[PDB]
Amino acid sequence: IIITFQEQKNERACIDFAISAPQNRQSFQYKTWTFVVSPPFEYFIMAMIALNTVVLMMKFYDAPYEYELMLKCLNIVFTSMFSMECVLKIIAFGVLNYFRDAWNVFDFVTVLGSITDILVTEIAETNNFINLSFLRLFRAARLIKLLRQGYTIRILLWTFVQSFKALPYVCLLIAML
């Protein structure tokens, strides 16, 4: 099936087709931009993603109940620091220049879900619904930030996934089966 697969030159077409194809310096906005674009800031936030996932990995059954408390407090600290980092970006870069990144919006959504999870955990029992707990996906989904750091795995995933987007009817045939 691999050896004999019909196409429905190439690289030359792709190159010749794709050949077609920052913030100013006014005020404290520039101070925030210089603070957030500093390579130390990016390395620090990457390390903080790493430590947040370490904290996620630290949960275990029948914890001493003070270990649970320090895990919760570490989650509080990480969520608040990610929120203030999101605020630093939303002020340094334009709100239009932030919400139109497709990665900054992911960070914003995960931060909002994280504070929402914190708020609900205190008063979860008053809701009494099945969806009381899906808000814990956001802390685990902050692990996706390291996917960007892993460059070649990101490229491989992107190529294969967008290939899947180019095949919406083979999956439909499988679903019909």
Ligand X SMILES: CC(C)CCC[C@@H](C)[C@H]1CC[C@H]2[C@@H]3CC=C4C[C@@H](OC(=O)CCC(=O)O)CC[C@]4(C)[C@H]3CC[C@]12C
Give the interface with ligand R16 as residue ranges (CB under 6 A): 54, 58, 64, 67, 168, 171-172, 175
Interface characters, 2-41, with ligand X (x: CB under 6 A):
----------------------------------------
Alpha helices (runs of H) in the chain, residue ranges in sequence order: 10-18, 28-37, 39-57, 67-92, 95-99, 104-123, 137-141, 145-149, 151-165, 170-176
Closest CA to 117 of 83, 87, 79: 79
**Size of the residue set binding ligand X (CB under 6 A):** 5
Span 140-169, contacts to ligand X by CB under 6 A: none
CB 93 within 8 A of CB 23: yes
Residues with Cβ within 8 Å of residue 58, at least 6 apart in sequence: 71
The least distance separating ligand R16 from the CB of residue 172, rounded to whole angstroms, comes to 5
Handedness of CA 141, 133, 61, 52 (dihedral sign): positive
Report in angstroms how near the CB of residue 41 gets to ligand X at its nearest. Answer: 23
The nearer residue to ligand X, 59 or 100, going by C-beta atoms, is: 59
Residues 5, 17, 28, 60: which binds ligand X (CB under 6 A)? 60
**Nearest distance from residue 53's CB to ligand X, in Å?**
8
Binding site for ligand X (CB under 6 A): 54, 57-58, 60, 62
